Design a protein around this ligand. Structure first.
Ligand code: F32
Ligand code: MG
Length: 296
């Protein structure tokens, strides 16, 4: 994996490798996302879920949400990638979380980034100010949160106001990953990834984790590609058989544009190569990433 990396970095050809991927990427219809009535449900007109893998809300008036189910068969993990909720789609977002039985939500963006609005404030910031999404009959409450230097983990309680059933949802919020950018370091990224892994929110006993940034393709694509490559390296006989480009194209069969820049692709290589040390038996790298990430 690093031989390939070193030959690419050596030749300074990441832009060409990345562009080959875009050109070879699947192209499936997004007819439902394009219906006139769903316009105010899409943050960006050039970012849509394919009809074949879009997530359907259980309601009847309209079952559309700009979200895609990315199902990696060999890696044995599913992810729902979605855009940052819009003011009018926060209830839809939590309805999806509820109907798909997700246990965790991974947010890789901030509400405002460099003077631009990227996502609505869909979770409560204060314990005493819970949120009610009337349209979907859901109640959302901030139970507590653990604020680190580059990310925050929140414990939320989501309640179906109809049956009174409640469930705890974990919010993993990476607050320092720049749009069209990369994380500060492989160690800071992997520390975050493994926190999500250790929480149990990715366990198959739950619905797919819900991952989003602003459009649900760039930063979200990177997070998922890395997690999937590491899952594959841990399951196969030979972990050197993992081809990140092939994995990215496979993921791209489910949602368009995963990985928005050549440098995000390169970072993915680096994150996977570093994380491989934990797979190959190094029972100490995990603590090291924690230390190096300087989360306190
Ligand atoms: O790393 C990343 C890139 C982000 C991102 C944000 C927005 C868009 C869609 C946006 N479309 C749109 N942006 C706007 C803004 C105002 C009014 C209407 C529209 S459509 C977009 N398409 C672009 C094409 C070339 C270069 C930059 C672009 N940004 C894609 C990816 S992310 O949240 O998926 N993580
Ligand atoms: Mg307070």
């Amino acid at each position: 994996m690093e031989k390939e990396f070193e030959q690419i970095d050596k030749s300074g050809s990441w832009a060409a490798i990345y562009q080959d991927i875009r050109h070879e990427a699947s192209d499936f219809p997004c007819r439902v996302a394009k219906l006139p009535k769903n316009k105010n449900r899409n943050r960006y007109r050039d970012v849509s879920p394919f009809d074949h893998s879009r997530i359907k809300l259980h309601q009847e008036d309209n079952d559309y949400i700009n979200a895609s189910l990315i199902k990696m068969e060999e890696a044995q993990r599913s992810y729902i990638l979605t855009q940052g909720p819009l003011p009018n789609t926060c209830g839809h977002f939590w309805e999806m979380v509820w109907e798909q039985k997700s246990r965790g939500v991974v947010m890789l963006n901030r509400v405002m980034e460099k003077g631009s609005l990227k996502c609505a404030q869909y979770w409560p910031q204060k314990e005493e100010k819970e949120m009610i999404f009337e349209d979907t009959n859901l109640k959302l409450t901030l139970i507590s949160e653990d604020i680190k230097s580059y990310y925050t983990v929140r414990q939320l309680e989501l309640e179906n106001l109809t049956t009174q059933e409640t469930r705890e949802i974990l919010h993993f919020h990476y607050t320092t990953w720049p749009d069209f950018g990369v994380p500060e370091s492989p160690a800071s990224f992997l520390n975050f990834l493994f926190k999500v892994r250790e929480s149990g929110s990715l366990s198959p006993e739950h619905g797919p984790v819900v991952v989003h940034c602003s459009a649900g393709i760039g930063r979200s694509g990177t997070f998922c590609l890395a997690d999937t490559c590491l899952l594959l390296m841990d399951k196969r006989k030979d972990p050197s058989s993992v081809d990140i480009k092939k994995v990215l194209l496979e993921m791209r069969k489910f949602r368009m544009g995963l990985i928005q820049t050549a440098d995000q692709l390169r970072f993915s290589y680096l994150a996977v190569i570093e994380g491989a040390k934990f797979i190959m038996g190094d029972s100490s790298v995990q603590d090291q990433w924690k230390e190096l990430s300087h989360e306190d």
